[PDB]
Design a protein around this ligand. Structure first.
Ligand SMILES: Nc1nc2c(ncn2[C@@H]2O[C@H](COP(=O)(O)OP(=O)(O)NP(=O)(O)O)[C@@H](O)[C@H]2O)c(=O)[nH]1
Ligand SMILES: [Mg+2]
Lengths: 211, 126
């Protein structure tokens, strides 16, 4: 558990991929199915840096009006934020200024990153030349794709540099130290290896030639 | 055209085997994606071997980190897959970490999938 931690609030229209981006950093999962977030979901993200560890307490808020409720509670004491839209949906970019107002109303001068998601998709509607919202010193923009992991760590790296005051701070990998051995029951292990050999109830995933 | 994704791979000089892969874990009745990464087999101070999977990112997110137990379920299935059962570390369900989980390790080719199945079984024995 790092001592250094910051509250980060993540906002944007529903369907823009806010939750999918957090899961990529949290568990590496990517769910094709759209399941809207209800209220807010708070997840901790730990990053190792050249100056020590950092923890972002990410408040992943719901983007849909009917699912978000009153958002002031999610924002208070937030020390940074991420605004997100979908480059395949021009409306989500039209609403970016609205999310920016709500954040500045409750949080004032916090470092914010603008992230245009789903750049992995060919038919892009919100192109970079068209994106001109960011103009200030406390605002930044990045193209990202939570599916292809394009600019994976950029939004957090920029926030960590502003929050720590070190333009040269760098993220580093976490060492993989030998874990504890887990003893299994031999009979149970035999039963598992049998269920594997015969029980193939779950279908093997489809063979995307990603590798 | 969608931008290319460039990654400076996190290297594990101490590994004696390393293969790019895609990882899945069985929950409900589906194999949920855990991400593309690189499977590493590394030495320990004992004769046991460390099974490590780092994500295909600049940060090398640790998707799996487990010592290979002697009686680890290990079976070859599919075109290019290898199944195993182990108590995941890092945990997949924080509430019930101790429960073993069935896991699918995909690799690019059937031949190199057959190779992964071989050396894993070789390291169960130690
Ligand atoms: N092609 C593509 N699809 C993506 C990407 N990120 C998310 N999606 C998809 O977009 C949909 C919405 O994702 P989700 O993470 O739930 O978005 P959200 O903004 O958290 N929704 P809500 O505000 O209601 O919680 C899902 O079908 C998800 O798989 C991406 O980078 N590329
Ligand atoms: Mg969501």
């Amino acid at each position: 558990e790092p001592q250094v931690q910051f509250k980060l609030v993540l906002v944007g229209d529903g369907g823009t991929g806010k939750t999918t981006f957090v899961k990529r950093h949290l568990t590496g999962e990517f769910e094709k199915k759209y399941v809207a977030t209800l209220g807010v979901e708070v997840h901790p993200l730990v990053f190792h840096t050249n100056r020590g560890p950092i923890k972002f307490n990410v408040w992943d808020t719901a983007g849909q009006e009917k699912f978000g409720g009153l958002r002031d509670g999610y924002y208070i004491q937030a020390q940074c934020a991420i605004i997100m839209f979908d480059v395949t949906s021009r409306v989500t970019y039209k609403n970016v200024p609205n999310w920016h107002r709500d954040l500045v109303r409750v949080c004032e001068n916090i470092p914010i990153v603008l992230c245009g998601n789903k750049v992995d998709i060919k038919d892009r509607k919100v192109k970079a030349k068209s994106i001109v919202f960011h103009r200030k010193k406390n605002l930044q923009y990045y193209d990202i794709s939570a599916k292809s992991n394009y600019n994976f760590e950029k939004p957090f790296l920029w926030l960590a540099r502003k929050l720590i005051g070190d333009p040269n701070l760098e993220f580093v990998a976490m060492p993989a130290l030998a874990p504890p051995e887990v003893v299994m029951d031999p009979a149970l292990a035999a039963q598992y290896e049998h269920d594997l050999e015969v029980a193939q109830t779950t279908a093997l995933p489809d063979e995307d030639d990603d590798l | 055209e969608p931008p290319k994704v460039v990654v400076t791979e996190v290297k594990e000089e101490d590994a004696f085997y390393s293969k790019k892969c895609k990882l899945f874990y069985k929950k409900d009745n589906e194999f949920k994606e855990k991400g593309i990464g690189t499977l590493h087999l590394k030495p320990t101070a004992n004769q046991k071997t460390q099974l490590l999977v780092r994500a295909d990112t600049n940060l090398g997110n640790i998707l799996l980190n487990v010592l290979i137990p002697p009686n680890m379920p290990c079976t070859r299935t599919g075109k290019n897959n290898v199944l195993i059962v182990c108590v995941p570390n890092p945990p997949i369900d924080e509430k019930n970490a101790t429960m073993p989980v069935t896991m699918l390790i995909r690799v690019k080719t059937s031949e190199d999938a057959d190779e992964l199945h071989k050396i894993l079984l070789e390291k169960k024995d130690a």
